[PDB]
Amino acid sequence: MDDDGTGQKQIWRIEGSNKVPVDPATYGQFYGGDSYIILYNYRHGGRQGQIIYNWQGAQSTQDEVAASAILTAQLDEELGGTPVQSRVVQGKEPAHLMSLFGGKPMIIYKGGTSREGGQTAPASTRLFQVRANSAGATRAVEVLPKAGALNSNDAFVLKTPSAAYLWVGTGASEAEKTGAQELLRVLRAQPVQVAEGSEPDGFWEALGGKAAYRTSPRLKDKKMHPPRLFACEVPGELMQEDLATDDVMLLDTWDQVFVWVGKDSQEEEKTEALTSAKRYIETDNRDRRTPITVVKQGFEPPSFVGWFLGWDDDYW
Ligand SMILES: [Ca+2]
Ligand SMILES: [Ca+2]
Ligand SMILES: [Ca+2]
């Protein structure tokens, strides 16, 4: 879609059974715990059109999803059945949707709203993982504020009641550094720039203590054979939900192939997958000493988890 993303748009958040207008000053910022509807009006190649994007946050509940279905059908009917429809889950946004916020990164907060609990309040200390894809689309995703959440391939923003830090992983790109800066703007905080490896003591303290985190030779490399996750190939950002718990998945990071074993995958799926990995590495050229590392659901090592966009240790 060559439309440039600058058309007029309206964004609503599913709240209970209704769609509620989102504060226009915050378009581009979303709660991962919620579902949203975006009505985008555009004019391109001399013709006017509309697109309804249904965006489902990674933690949005099934009842919100069911509510959006009703809301979107109503909107569509209201509009005379003219808009183009596109359903999108967090992390799988098309380039055109990412372009709707004038170059700003899509920011995804933890929490959200619910019938039973209403709107959650922001935590006092927060950490955001900022990652951009090859095309440059950038996402700032809030995660738990612990040292273990860091990964060398991205930029991170840590905000506390008393300080802000922009941590730059060794493999982070300028797009990630720039998105981090924009996020800091939204958070109204001035950061202390920190390069991975020369963190001041105040940074580790804010995170509750220094600890090992997600790193490896590949995660540290700025360059980037981008890692591919193959189903028992998964496009978009690598999300924890892409790991089929009843199956076995392969994550190829070039100098290493991980064999991820779902808790409910049958024994034979691991066997086949291992056989396949060996062959995959020999189909090609590379090295025959390419390690094939087996990992089990819930016991993933940091060198594996680092490739994911914002992992939740309790996800399962
Ligand atoms: Ca919600
Ligand atoms: Ca990165
Ligand atoms: Ca299976």
Query: Domain map of the chain by residue range?
Result: 1-121, 122-216, 218-316
- What separation in Å is there between the alpha carbon of 253 and the centre of ligand 3? 23
- What separation in Å is there between the alpha carbon of 112 and the centre of ligand 1? 5
Q: Is CATH 1.10.3720.10 what the domain over 218-316 is classified as, yes or no?
A: no
Ligand number, closest to the Cα atom of 133: 2
Give 1-121's CATH code, choosing from 3.40.20.10, 3.30.460.80, 3.40.50.970, 3.60.9.10: 3.40.20.10
Ligand number, closest to the Cα atom of 30: 1
Solved using:
X-ray
Letter string b/e over residues 172-197, b meaning 16 or more CB atoms within 10 A of that residue's CB: bbebbbbbbbbbbebbebebeebebe
Ligand number, closest to the Cα atom of 214: 2
d(CA 236, CA 61): 21
Known binding-site positions for Ca(2+): 33-34, 64, 76, 81, 83, 113, 153-154, 176, 246-247, 269
Q: In CATH terms, are 1-121 and 218-316 the same topology? A: yes
- What separation in Å is there between the alpha carbon of 37 and the centre of ligand 1? 13
Ligand number, closest to the Cα atom of 120: 1
Give 122-216's CATH code, choosing from 3.10.20.30, 3.40.20.10, 3.40.50.2300, 3.30.2350.10: 3.40.20.10
Known binding-site positions: 33-34, 64, 76, 81, 83, 113, 153-154, 176, 246-247, 269
Report resolution in angstroms.
2.0
